[PDB]
Amino acid sequence: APSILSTESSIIVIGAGTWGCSTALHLARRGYKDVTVLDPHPVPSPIAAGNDINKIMEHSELKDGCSDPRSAAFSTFTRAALKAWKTDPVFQPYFHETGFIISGHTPALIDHIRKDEVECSETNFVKLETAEDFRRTMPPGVLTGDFPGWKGWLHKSGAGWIHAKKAMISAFNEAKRLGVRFVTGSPEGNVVSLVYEDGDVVGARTADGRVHKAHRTILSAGAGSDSLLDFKKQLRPTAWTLCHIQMGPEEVKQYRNLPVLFNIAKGFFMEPDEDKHELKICDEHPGYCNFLPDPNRPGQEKSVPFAKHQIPLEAEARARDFLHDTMPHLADRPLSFARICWDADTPDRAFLIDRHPEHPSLLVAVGGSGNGAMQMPTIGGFIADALESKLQKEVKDIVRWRPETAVDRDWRATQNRFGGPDRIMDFQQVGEDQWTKIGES
Numbered sequence: 001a002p003s004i005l006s007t008e009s010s011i012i013v014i015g016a017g018t019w020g021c022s023t024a025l026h027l028a029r030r031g032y033k034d035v036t037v038l039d040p041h042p043v044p045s046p047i048a049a050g051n052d053i054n055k056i057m058e059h060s061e062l063k064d065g066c067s068d069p070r071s072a073a074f075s076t077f078t079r080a081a082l083k084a085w086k087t088d089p090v091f092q093p094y095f096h097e098t099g100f101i102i103s104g105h106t107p108a109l110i111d112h113i114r115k116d117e118v119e120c121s122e123t124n125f126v127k128l129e130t131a132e133d134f135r136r137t138m139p140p141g142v143l144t145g146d147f148p149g150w151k152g153w154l155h156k157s158g159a160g161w162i163h164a165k166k167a168m169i170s171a172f173n174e175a176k177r178l179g180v181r182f183v184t185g186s187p188e189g190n191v192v193s194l195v196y197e198d199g200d201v202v203g204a205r206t207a208d209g210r211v212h213k214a215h216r217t218i219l220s221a222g223a224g225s226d227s228l229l230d231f232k233k234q235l236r237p238t239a240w241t242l243c244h245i246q247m248g249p250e251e252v253k254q255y256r257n258l259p260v261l262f263n264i265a266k267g268f269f270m271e272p273d274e275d276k277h278e279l280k281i282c283d284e285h286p287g288y289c290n291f292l293p294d295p296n297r298p299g300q301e302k303s304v305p306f307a308k309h310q311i312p313l314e315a316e317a318r319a320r321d322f323l324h325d326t327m328p329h330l331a332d333r334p335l336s337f338a339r340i341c342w343d344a345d346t347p348d349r350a351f352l353i354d355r356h357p358e359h360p361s362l363l364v365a366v367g368g369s370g371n372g373a374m375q376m377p378t379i380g381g382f383i384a385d386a387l388e389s390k391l392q393k394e395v396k397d398i399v400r401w402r403p404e405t406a407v408d409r410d411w412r413a414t415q416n417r418f419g420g421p422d423r424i425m426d427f428q429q430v431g432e433d434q435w436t437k438i439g440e441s
């Protein structure tokens, strides 16, 4: 039914974010001559979850008795990703293999980590038992806290952090040098609808009323994808929170080459960025939704993203609680920046990358599920493979279109996340005066 795919086939990519820029770059490398990317914002988009001074990268090989099909698929994604972060000239300068510490501060959290993470991994970890053990993982003056009740595990190699924002820009620049066209801005790149003819997708319509036609359309608009196609509940747009503290010009010099410090029920931080010397803290929790009436499902809810360069005050407080335990000397410092950041969870938090069974010219590439940024170097390769009907067997069935897994989906499932109230939160229940007020009077 669909037109025969060739390198001369016109291709539209909706969304110039983490996955879209990667897909554009891979398509261009494969020789596709007519690729156009649409985005309501210029790269890097302010609403792209990948637009972040840092994200965590981690790869684990699993012991045999822990390798179900879904986790084997994920290891396949991250194995490929890790290799590319270390080699692809477009991405290599932005990966910092500083290691990764996973930890918890109650017996139940520690046991969950030991049983379900550490003992399933082929990684050899260093066990951190005491506050002193924690502090010694970083240079003097960095970690100063008492880590009360904390125990953890340090993974030295195959993990660290990536400069997601610069790597995205790097992928964008290279896609462009290789001939990809980017229509980025509003209304010209703001897609409001897919375009249908004969029951197939033939392109995209933007908010200026222009119709963009293509032989293939790739939907990779992150959380925003959920309003451009009926995903049959397969996506839950969900938001996490970050804030930055601005480090001083002398103090920042100790904060170099730091392993990621992650408490699965409190949060994490990464080292200050090279440009602004800002230290980022994410407070860990199951996520905020923004539950509004589903326009197509009477009596049902649907989480709808919105952009804000503030975070709820309760999130800031969780971030400072994390700081009190680890770096109390910073716990009262003013925030220089904060924002909410949107991704979308599938029901099993595996990716969703597949051609649409009812519209063969449409490829969806969505469902980052909290783990999509570290995939940036290689995800466009899997996505391109899917477009070319050769997505490899280790992953293709795990990431397929699977609406049957989302029937009567419970939006308030915590989906293996912890922290804060240990429940899914709702922005509709956050008071208008209950946000940070960075940059205001």
Ligand SMILES: Cc1cc2nc3c(=O)[nH]c(=O)nc-3n(C[C@H](O)[C@H](O)[C@H](O)COP(=O)(O)OP(=O)(O)OC[C@H]3O[C@@H](n4cnc5c(N)ncnc54)[C@H](O)[C@@H]3O)c2cc1C
Residues within 6 Å of the ligand: 014, 015, 016, 017, 018, 019, 020, 038, 039, 040, 041, 045, 046, 047, 048, 049, 050, 051, 054, 055, 056, 057, 189, 190, 191, 192, 220, 221, 222, 223, 224, 225, 228, 239, 240, 241, 242, 282, 341, 342, 343, 365, 366, 367, 368, 369, 370, 371, 372, 373, 374, 375
């Ligand atoms: C706080 C937070 C921390 C995270 N930490 C990590 C981590 O440490 N490691 C990790 O691997 N992952 C992490 N993630 C997840 C990761 O950021 C996402 O999975 C990944 O960036 C998603 O990539 P994406 O391309 O699907 O979406 P995005 O990067 O959000 O890009 C989507 C793009 O689509 C565009 N768009 C939107 N709407 C429309 C429209 N109508 N038309 C056209 N275009 C459009 C947007 O402007 C945007 O540029 C984190 C996520 C959050 C929220």
